[PDB]
Amino acid sequence: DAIDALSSDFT
Amino acid sequence: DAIDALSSDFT
Amino acid sequence: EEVRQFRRLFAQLAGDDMEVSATELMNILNKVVTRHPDLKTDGFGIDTCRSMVAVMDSDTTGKLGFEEFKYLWNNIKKWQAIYKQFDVDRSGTIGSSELPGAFEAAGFHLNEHLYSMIIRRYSDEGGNMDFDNFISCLVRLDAMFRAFKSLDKDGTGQIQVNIQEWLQLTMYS
Amino acid sequence: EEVRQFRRLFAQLAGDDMEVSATELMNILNKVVTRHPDLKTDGFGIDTCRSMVAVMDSDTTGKLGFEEFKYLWNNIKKWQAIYKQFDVDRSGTIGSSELPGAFEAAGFHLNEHLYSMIIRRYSDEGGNMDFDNFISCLVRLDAMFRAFKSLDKDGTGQIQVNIQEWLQLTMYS
Ligand SMILES: [Ca+2]
Ligand SMILES: [Ca+2]
Ligand SMILES: [Ca+2]
Ligand SMILES: [Ca+2]
Ligand SMILES: [Ca+2]
Ligand SMILES: [Ca+2]
Ligand SMILES: [Ca+2]
Ligand SMILES: [Ca+2]
C-alpha cells in the first residue's frame, strides 16, 4: 500500500 | 585444487 | 501539503522505532522495483543498502529518519526518470553510450578519468549499468559532493582532515 | 619460495587476462567459505567484492593483479584466524562483547565513536559480526588507514584534498 504510492512515483 | 590450497590456509 | 502526506506514507514504511533501517530500506526498494520489470537489476543487496543508509544518516542515528528518507526517495524518483529517459534501447539498463548523458541529466559534470573509475566500479562488462547500480552510484556521488561542500567551510575548494575524520567519513559509508 | 608457489596457484585462479575481477573474486571467496561452514555468512556479495577490488586496485587496472591478490589473501587468512580466535562460544559469528578484542588482535585500535559507527555499518541486529562483514570491514579499514598514510607525505597527521581527489578516493572504493 505505501509501497503502491512509492511505486507510482516511478515514471 | 587451487581452492583446496586456499582453503588449507584457513584455520 | 505534500510533506505531511509523505509523513503519513512514512509511518507505514518505518520500522518499530519510526526510522528506516538498511534492511527495511532494502525490502522497500525491492518491492518497488519488482513492480517495474522494465528496470533491470538483480535487486538491491543488503551491503548496498547499508552503505546508502550510512551516507544518508547525517545525524548518525544508524537509520533513516523521515527527513533523510524523504531526501533519499526524492532523488531516487528524480534519478529513476532519467534512467527510463536514457534507456533508449529500452534494454532495461543504460547502455555505455547513454550513461555520460544520464549523469549529465542528473546534473553531474565529471572528469574523464573519474568517469571511467565510476564506470569500472559500477557498470557491467559491457560498460552498461543496471538500476540498483545506477541508483546506488548516484546516491553516493550525490552524498560525496554534499559532504565535500559541507566540509569546505571557508569555501576554498579544498578540505583538510585528520586520520580520525578520514576513517569516519570513509568507513561510515 | 612460497611466493613462487602462490604464483602457480594464482595462475589457476585468475581470469583470461591473469587478473582477478570482482566476479572471479566473489566466486573464489564463496568457494572457500562454503568449505568452512563454522564461519557464518550469507556469502560475499558482488557489491562488496567490487568494493574490495577497487580499494585494493592500486594501479587502477580494474582488477586484482598477482601482488594485489596475494596481499589481499595474506590479510584474509590472517584475519580469518583472528575470527576463529574470537568466536569464543563457537556461534559462527563474532559476538558483540568479543568484537573490540577482535579488531585489536587484527592490529586496529579505534576510539569509541569511530568504533560505534563501524559496528552500525557492519554488524547484525545483536551487534554481532558475521564472516564476510568482518573481512570486508577490515579490508576497507586497512585500505583507508594505508590511503591516509600515503597521502600524509608530510608526516603532519593531516591531508588536504580538492573535489576531484575526494571523489576519486571515495567513489573508487
Ligand atoms: Ca526500523
Ligand atoms: Ca545490480
Ligand atoms: Ca538517521
Ligand atoms: Ca539501454
Ligand atoms: Ca579476469
Ligand atoms: Ca590492479
Ligand atoms: Ca561467537
Ligand atoms: Ca554478511
CATH code of residue D172: 1.10.238.10
Greatest CA span in chain A, whole angstroms?
A: 18
Contact B2 D9 (CB under 8 A): yes
Which amino acid does the sequence have at D51? S
Residue D120: which residues within 8 A CB-CB, separation 6 or more? C54, C62, C172
Please report the sign of the dihedral spanned by the C-alpha atoms of residue C5, residue C9, residue C11, residue C15.
negative
Residue D49's CB: how many other CB atoms inside 10 A?
24
- Whether there are 3 or more C-beta pairs closer than 8 Å between C and D is yes
Contact C32 A6 (CB under 8 A): yes
Ligand 5 centre from C1 Cα, in Å?
53
Q: How many Å separate Cα B10 from the centre of its chain? A: 7
Q: How many Å separate Cα D9 from the centre of its chain? A: 20
Query: In units of Å, what resolution does this entry have?
Result: 2.0
Specify burial of residue D125 (Cβ count, 10 A radius: 0-12, 13-18, 19+).
Answer: exposed
B8 in Cβ contact with D9 (< 8 Å):
no
Residue D59: which residues within 8 A CB-CB, separation 6 or more? D65, D68
Specify burial of residue C28 (Cβ count, 10 A radius: 0-12, 13-18, 19+).
Answer: buried
Q: Which of C10, C28, C36 sits opposite A10 (nearest CB)?
A: C36
Distance, in Å, from the CA atom of C129 to the CA atom of C127, rounded to the nearest integer, reads 7
Distance, in Å, from the CA atom of C108 to the CA atom of C173, rounded to the nearest integer, reads 20
Distance, in Å, from the CA atom of D61 to the CA atom of D66, rounded to the nearest integer, reads 12
Q: How many Å separate Cα C137 from the centre of its chain? A: 6
From its phi and psi, is residue D43 left (phi > 0), alpha (psi between -120 and 50) or beta?
left
DSSP assigned state of B11:
-
Residue with C-alpha cell 538500476? C131
Ligand 4 centre from C82 Cα, in Å?
12
Distance, in Å, from the CA atom of D136 to the CA atom of D130, rounded to the nearest integer, reads 10
Contact D161 C158 (CB under 8 A): yes
Task: Give all strands (DSSP E) within chain D, no chain letters.
Answer: 158-162
Specify burial of residue C37 (Cβ count, 10 A radius: 0-12, 13-18, 19+).
Answer: exposed
Which amino acid does the sequence have at D63? K
Per this entry, what is the length of chain C? 173
Specify burial of residue C101 (Cβ count, 10 A radius: 0-12, 13-18, 19+).
Answer: middle
Distance, in Å, from the CA atom of D78 to the CA atom of D81, rounded to the nearest integer, reads 5
Distance, in Å, from the CA atom of D52 to the CA atom of D25, rounded to the nearest integer, reads 9
In the 3-class helix/strand/coil scheme, how is chain C assigned residue by residue?
CHHHHHHHHHHHHCCCCCCECHHHHHHHHHHHHHCCCCCCCCCCCHHHHHHHHHHHCCCCCCCECHHHHHHHHHHHHHHHHHHHHHCCCCCCCECCCCHHHHHHHCCCCCCHHHHHHHHHHHCCCCCCECHHHHHHHHHHHHHHHHHHHHHCCCCCCEEEEEHHHHHHHHHCC
Taking contacts as CB-CB distances below 8 angstroms, the residues of chain D near B2 are 9-10, 12-13
- Distance (Å) from the C-alpha of residue D91 to the closest C-alpha of chain B? 16
Provide the number of structural domains found in chain C.
Answer: 1
Domain span at C43? 1-173
- Distance (Å) from the C-alpha of residue A6 to the closest C-alpha of chain C? 7
* Alpha helices (runs of H) in D35-125, residue ranges in sequence order: 46-56, 66-86, 99-105, 112-122
> Chain B window 1-11: which residues touch D at a Cβ cutoff of 8 Å?
1-3, 5-7, 9-11
Distance, in Å, from the CA atom of C67 to the CA atom of C49, rounded to the nearest integer, reads 17
Q: At what angle do helices D112-122 and C46-56 cross, to 10 degrees?
A: 140
Distance, in Å, from the CA atom of D44 to the CA atom of C139, rounded to the nearest integer, reads 22
Ligand 1 centre from C79 Cα, in Å?
25
Nearest-by-CA chain D residue for B4: D32
